[PDB]
Amino acid sequence: AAIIGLMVAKFXYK
């Protein structure tokens, strides 16, 4: 597993 982030500005594991 690894850390996941999403950026839409606004920015948040699996």
Add this chain to the structure above:
Amino acid sequence: AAIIGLMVAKFXYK
């Protein structure tokens, strides 16, 4: 204190 990230691509608190 906050979570800080830097993006230069590659992407890492105080």
